[PDB]
Write a protein that binds this ligand. Structure first.
Ligand SMILES: [Cl-]
Ligand SMILES: [Cl-]
Lengths: 139, 140
């Protein structure tokens, strides 16, 4: 077809395929993959805590998405919110869940088990310039 | 990091970045990219018509998403529904005009991928193809 059409279709399909697989893995924890990614970020943050604004900056997601995500994590007992002297803090239940979910996701290679490491590395390398332009690799 | 983690993150991010770009291009037509894709599908279907079950299968979305999309296209005068001699969705002449215009705009900005050369776009297609084959994308 047209190269741009072929490429965008491929990326769209790959995202749908993989999202289907990883969402199924985290569903038993009351998570979606997006909510899982927010928990992971908190486990790499000082005191398990970030301002909502910084969560969005680090995940490269819109503030309205952060709000919805954090609220649903609180609803599940996995995060607590407080005013910023809003700060989101991972709870001990949240830490237990993300450890378990990560183990489960690792065990199925995030849906890419049928690929080898070379092919996964190619995916990273080829999509990197698009991400650089979006700011993913700058503070 | 771990190769699978790096790859899935890359795909998720690329999809987000491109979706934002192409949603912005089709917004002036009252569309989202998902609604655009449904119109394009109809323009490759006999008589511009498909059963809604078939639209869901081809777009890989939930039946309630197909209804949302089709019903919003009807609201805009771009599709009409009728019972299947299920339900058939048919693109209208206004629908055909809109999807022509939206496609020209998307083509002009290379669906968000114009910073890549043709070789790079072809590599993206080729690298993701085996994943798609396993999902049934290249078989009847
Ligand atoms: Cl904040
Ligand atoms: Cl139907």
């Amino acid at each position: 077809g047209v190269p741009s059409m072929a490429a965008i279709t491929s990326i769209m399909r790959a995202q749908q395929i993989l999202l289907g697989e990883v969402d199924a893995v985290v569903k038993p924890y009351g998570l979606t993959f997006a909510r899982y990614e927010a928990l992971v970020l908190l486990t790499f943050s000082k005191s398990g805590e970030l301002p909502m604004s910084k969560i969005g900056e680090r995940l490269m997601v819109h503030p309205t998405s952060v709000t919805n995500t954090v609220d649903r994590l609180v609803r599940s007992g996995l995060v607590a919110k407080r005013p910023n002297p809003t700060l989101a803090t991972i709870t001990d239940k949240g830490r237990e869940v993300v450890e378990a979910a990560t183990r489960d996701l690792m065990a199925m290679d995030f849906g890419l088990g049928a690929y080898d490491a070379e092919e996964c590395g190619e995916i990273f390398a080829m999509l990197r310039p698009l991400r650089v332009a979006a700011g993913d690799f700058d503070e």
